[PDB]
From Swiss-Prot:
Annotated protein name in UniProt: Peptidyl-prolyl cis-trans isomerase NIMA-interacting 4
GO cellular component terms listed in the entry, alphabetical order: chromosome; cytoplasm; mitochondrial matrix; nucleolus; nucleoplasm; nucleus; preribosome; spindle
Record's function text: Isoform 1 is involved as a ribosomal RNA processing factor in ribosome biogenesis. Binds to tightly bent AT-rich stretches of double-stranded DNA. Isoform 2 binds to double-stranded DNA.
Organism of this sequence: Homo sapiens
PTM characteristics: Phosphorylated. Isoform 1 phosphorylation occurs both in the nucleus and the cytoplasm. The unphosphorylated isoform 1 associates with the pre-rRNP complexes in the nucleus.
Gene name tied to this protein: PIN4
Amino acid sequence: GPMGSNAVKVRHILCEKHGKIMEAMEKLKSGMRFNEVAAQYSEDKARQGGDLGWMTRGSMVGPFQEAAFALPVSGMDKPVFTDPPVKTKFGYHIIMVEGRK
Ligand code: NA
Ligand code: NA
């Protein structure tokens, strides 16, 4: 149905280990731009600054999806990201959303 048309343009930092995602979180809280944190730490989409692009409802792993649709759109000078990190079967994610449908 209608909810299958919902989507987010989403960016993340993924780290298997909790200690490393915590290092990434500290960099965000120091003011580092999200894409630069993703380049330093992410194990997915690092060469894209963490950008996953547009993702439709159903296409994201469950805990990620719930966290992502809960975030308002933000930009990387004024980011709104998940805190605490979100655990999935891939590891720990810090997520921000740059577009919403
Ligand atoms: Na861990
Ligand atoms: Na999961």
